[PDB]
């Protein structure tokens, strides 16, 4: 049926190309889009074409692109291919955009996801010229129903001089009602409002994004799917990680340090997350609750079985098969899921009050349990900090999970010193790899190192780590957090130079003797 | 006037020595004490003497010492000298204890100060065997009136099996009424309560700590002073920093990015932050309010000048002379000050809600604006992260302040890579040295570097930093955050090897 139920706004409907003409060189553009869901698709494609055409004529044409979080091939991909983005924030997973960032062709800053809206309102990104937002429908009174994510869309609509809406008929109509949008002051000028959430299933707002219809300069009718990345079926490494984690949860419950329903759960996406979610479906724990950034495949499974009672998030992150499942059954799933603005889903006040358990991936940790989530060798961006800081620091328990090695064993995920730090020791209590689980609660840095080295490090790298540690203990400037600055980053340099962190036996290495 | 106003409790008075005997080897001890204020004094000394005797007899005798934040010679000092603390958290400024920590003789973890209560309730430090809390007075109904700080005392009282109270006649009886202790669930089992603070000057609790009298195993009458370390009268360097920041605030106000009375101010521990407050006391911003972790001399000065209307904190951090001033004028100041539990003063939910401006010192920052607050050369503890993270990450504006050099110019406070990170780039927007102010809002790492190097670095080090950055841009593995890993930490090593970061 008709998706634009406000008659007057129908007059604004126009082709993607025409809408794209509203976007000018130098513009700051805020868009919907979070974990590959709910980003605009047709206008960015048309924009990229016009950008390339300008460039070919020696005409400059780039934008500043501010999003909810990651988008997809139609947005980050097309614009990066066109070399059309001078600044990007706060989170990207597109390969072409990643290359632009790492070549210094696109300036990038990965703000904490829960803080983006506030910094935008503060003016940190400059004046927003355009808000470009995907919609399921437009209501009788001109409300904008978001699609598969909320992200920062309400904030972008508030700030933007002009607004473009893409109404996507691929998106199920019964998404209307799944969102909770607050008109409260979460991210505006102090003093802010108390965000009165005291349960993960609590709604505080309404189903629509609000915007002055007079700012709506174009509406584009679309029909195109999200980026539904393939399902990352757990491998033995992930299954092992999930096993150690579930054993730990079970023990915490038996010691009355967690209720049998655990606490509200936040998890990332990927092989390991999937393994944890399958473990949880099978585990002894009942009445689970999600308070996270994302809804993933394994969550629908638990919502269906009743193992999980509710799932709060800002976005969907589903395989094509899972999206298919939720579409054929949106009526049911809409009652089990709440999609929130990301400044609410990622609100530290709320995360702490609910006592979330945070479970996040990492590039690497050093022996003292400082965590790198972003910058390989310290300089090459992967995705971005995302909401890992929002959750890690605010959680009741902060847990980091990773294979003990990377790149087919040629890199150790436990290193003498992290090449970049995203999460300080104070923000990480539990580490899990396929080798075991380190519980660091109440430990000093030297004590942390003893646990991480013994429980988490791969056997191929443990002697090398222990050697570094032992010699640092003997020689470090101070002994509170012992280091040898002469070799702290030397394993990373070895990888840059040789493609492996494992040392040759053709030179002396202290641990070889 | 009698300090123990509950008659029944007077039967529990005993000597410090006898009290100390309640504390067993291996015990976890939660004490009052924050920025050199309100820590117990006599029991620790008696404990320390007894520990030395025991060690000499070949008897192990150590405890875990958990506090609000820093204490003083009678506590950290005495116990450190006796080699009697096997674990310490969350924050220390005593030289003897610091040496124990840097020698690996006392285990230490500097938690975010606002989180300590919750981690204690979670059991991260173990079962609390003892709470040793200094009080001004015990009310007729058995309330415990705190002294010069609140810190974590209410939590330690809740958790501890046995309670020892030191009632210190040295402390001003007029402290009674200054504290605001909330009986709601801030740091307990989830789901926690909403703390209904929506203005920095709002009281939501009562004047006393609550404890079941049955848990009080001993009360010790004491008479000794808090440890007031003086602040450096602002020199040329501090004054220049304060000047740049005040000008900055002025431009923000002019651009309508701050109100004319600014926002609630958090001013960190240390001389630099203090010097800024001195600038403010005669500044163009009126009707200021503090929502801070501590009230240092400079903030007391702002309340005196009338430039600041009210100040919230968990503790006093006053010089010996400022502490004398407030006691002689406790009536004037008592209505201008609110002392709260540290898990409330340092609550990220409240800090963000109020839109605090965070101003903190630092050891060093790298060219990308990562900040080290704690570990010199990456390994030697100074004080601790304290509340700098609670505030930096939650604040409306996060500002870091430091001389551009340390150790008489032999160390650059701006380095290629911080030897230890306490505050990531995302948690630091503004840097100020005596050389200038770097405004990093909205900038990528390479753009942050340009600002930090050009605005903040000392001229002796700027060319070296630029050289590092330019060659990194050319040769780094990735160009998003360019580094040369062979030399990223080489300045710190140069200092270790030669005593200076300046090459031959
Ligand atoms: C850290 C992070 C990249 C790990 O991803 P993951 O899917 O869990 O684990 P993977 O083992 O598959 O690694 C992902 C990539 O990082 C690489 N990687 C992981 N650890 C590495 C290391 N120590 N050194 C070099 N590369 C590493 C992998 O090779 C892989 O790269 P590829 O795509 O080229 O093959 C990911 O968790 C992330 O981006 N975190 C930041 C955002 C976040 O945590 N948000 C929380 C809410 S969703
Ligand atoms: C970082 C910190 C030590 C700086 O204190 P400060 O008084 O403002 O700065 P100063 O320049 O006077 O230096 C203080 C000490 O640190 C040392 N220092 C500062 N920068 C240094 C550097 N780059 N390298 C080595 N030492 C350094 C100084 O030498 C001095 O030590 P000394 O007396 O033994 O010579 C202090 O702010 C702190 O401990 N911060 C952590 C807690 C905090 O920020 N709490 C926030 C909420 S209250
Ligand atoms: Cl709130
Ligand atoms: Cl801990
Ligand atoms: Cl709250
Ligand atoms: Cl920013």
Swiss-Prot record, chain A:
Cite a single Pfam family from the UniProt record: AcetylCoA_hyd_C
InterPro entries for this protein: AcetylCoA_hyd_C, AcetylCoA_hyd_C_sf, ActCoA_hydro, ActCoA_hydro_N, NagB/RpiA_transferase-like, Succinate_CoA_transferase
Disruption phenotype annotation: Cells cannot grow on acetate and have lost the resistance to high levels of acetate, a characteristic of wild-type A.aceti.
Q: Could you tell me what reaction this enzyme catalyses?
A: succinyl-CoA + acetate = succinate + acetyl-CoA
Main EC class the enzyme belongs to: transferase
Q: How is its activity regulated?
A: Subject to competitive inhibition by coenzyme A (CoA).
Source organism, top-level taxon:
Bacteria
| GO BP annotations, alphabetical order | acetate catabolic process; acetyl-CoA biosynthetic process from acetate; succinyl-CoA catabolic process
This enzyme's EC code(s) = 2.8.3.18
Summarize induction of expression: Expressed at intermediate levels during the first growth phase, when ethanol is metabolized and acetic acid accumulates in the growth medium. Up-regulated during the second growth phase, when acetate is catabolized.
The pathway this protein participates in, as annotated, is:
Metabolic intermediate biosynthesis; acetyl-CoA biosynthesis
Q: Which residues of this protein are catalytic?
A: 293 (5-glutamyl coenzyme a thioester intermediate)
Q: List the disulfide bonds.
A: none
Entry binding sites for CoA: 268-272, 363, 383, 387, 407
For this chain, one GO molecular function annotation is: transferase activity
According to the record's subunit comment, the protein's assembly and interactions are:
Homodimer.
UniProt lists the family membership as follows: Belongs to the acetyl-CoA hydrolase/transferase family.
Primary role: Utilizes succinyl-CoA to convert toxic acetate to acetyl-CoA and succinate. Required for growth on acetic acid and for resistance to high levels of acetic acid. Also has low activity with acetoacetate as substrate.
What is the name of this protein? Succinyl-CoA:acetate CoA-transferase
